[PDB]
């Protein structure tokens, strides 16, 4: 994973996202959704999804939330106050903690001012607590600004490492982007049916055709402009649409 003071930032893009494999995986110790309850994720579409990744203590997972305070949310990773995404977290004691102490996971514990939301700060200047200038050397009131979790496998819960992923769905002003997968039933024939062909909503009897579209045309129309043929997206065969009987 990535440190807590330099988190990563992956920009998921145009794709088919299935948040159900996430939501029901039961391997996550924390799955909170804020802008939007979890079950309705596989039914919406946004412009961009960002995924941020890092590693923290066990009992600092409560500062990854909109409107908190503490050494993590103050100056390591700040979430805006109208967050939209979801926060996922799971214990990772066996991967990240090693006997003798894993001193490779640092965090920032001194900064001049709290972070703006989604702001990032990887500098390593000597912090200056008191009024006396520091001149790049340590000493009283001149502190190195990074400390390291010394993780060890015999730590009580709440001191073992947790891995965190923060998904943030954003909606700029584009034309569209990633959405959840569209599931399909079977196509029946020779029965007055209520059908939807990737947008085309209608009613009628479906029948095997013998016309030949051009290999970019989806549906056919009549004179007086009524849909009378379609192409099945999955198998790519033309089917006529006749109305079911009235009189």
């Amino acid at each position, epitope marked *: 994973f990535a440190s807590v003071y330099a988190w990563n930032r992956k920009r998921i893009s145009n794709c088919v996202a299935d948040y159900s494999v996430l939501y029901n995986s039961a391997s996550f110790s924390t799955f909170k959704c804020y802008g939007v309850s979890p079950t309705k994720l596989n039914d919406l579409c946004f412009t961009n999804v960002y995924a941020d990744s890092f590693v923290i203590r066990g009992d600092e997972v409560r500062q990854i939330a909109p409107g908190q305070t503490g050494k993590i949310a103050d100056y390591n990773y700040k979430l805006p106050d109208d967050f939209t995404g979801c926060v996922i977290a799971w214990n990772s004691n066996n991967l990240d903690s090693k006997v003798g102490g894993n001193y490779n996971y640092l965090y920032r514990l001194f900064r001049k001012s709290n972070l703006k939301p989604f702001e990032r700060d990887i500098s390593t200047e000597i912090y200056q607590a008191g009024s006396t200038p520091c001149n790049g050397v340590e000493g009283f009131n001149c502190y190195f600004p990074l400390q390291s*979790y010394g993780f060890q496998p015999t730590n009580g819960v709440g001191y073992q490492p947790y891995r965190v992923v923060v998904l943030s769905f954003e909606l700029l002003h584009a034309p569209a982007t990633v959405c959840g997968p569209k599931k399909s039933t079977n196509l029946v024939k020779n029965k007055c049916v209520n059908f939807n062909f990737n947008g085309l909503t209608g009613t009628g009897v479906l029948t095997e055709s013998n016309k030949k579209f051009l290999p970019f045309q989806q549906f056919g129309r009549d004179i007086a402009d009524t849909t009378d043929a379609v192409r099945d997206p999955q198998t790519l065969e033309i089917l006529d649409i006749t109305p079911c009987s009235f009189g």
Partner: antibody
Amino acid sequence: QVQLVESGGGVVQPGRSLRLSCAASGFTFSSYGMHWVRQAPGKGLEWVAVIWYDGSNKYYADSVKGRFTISRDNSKNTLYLQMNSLRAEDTAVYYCARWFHTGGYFDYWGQGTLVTVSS
Amino acid sequence: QPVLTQPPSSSASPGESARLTCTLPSDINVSSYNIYWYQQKPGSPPRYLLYYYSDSDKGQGSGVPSRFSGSKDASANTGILLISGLQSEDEADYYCMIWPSNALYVFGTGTKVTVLG
């Protein structure tokens, strides 16, 4: 289980030298950082010295520098402290403490031992 | 190195609630550090109690009943220990500590507490 015993205390005149031995047990000695912390008779606590898990971070205290040497031996699970040129004021009770790092605090102190710099 | 001033010898009577304070110097925004609290009975080594930084960043000490609670008030440069419901087993010295940079460990100056029996 985990328990730290200490020895080496006594009475000396200033200028001489002394060494203290903190023998551990229980836990696995060579996985932790160890401190020496002193307190005068009738005063507050005062940190003296630290040593990593042999990580060679000595980091003495501004009042002990150039006079105290801290060291360890995990082959015998032993922490040492060598004092020399005693200021006839470093008369106190000394404890060895274990440092729980990812929480950031001491635990498992060791009952201390008394050394008096008389004349 | 900073000096952590502590008023010696507070006191109260059983069932009451004592409020100890630990203040730094005119400099340093005590709302920038986490404060640790230790307790020492006579004839015994000290013992960790809790630490406080900015509620929702608290932490207790494995055997410390929920009586002891820490807080922190900004415009006095002061951290606060709060015992609620004193008993006849809190006669001890309470030290406040800060740990800035694994280079120095600063202790308070001590504070006696006695429950008037």
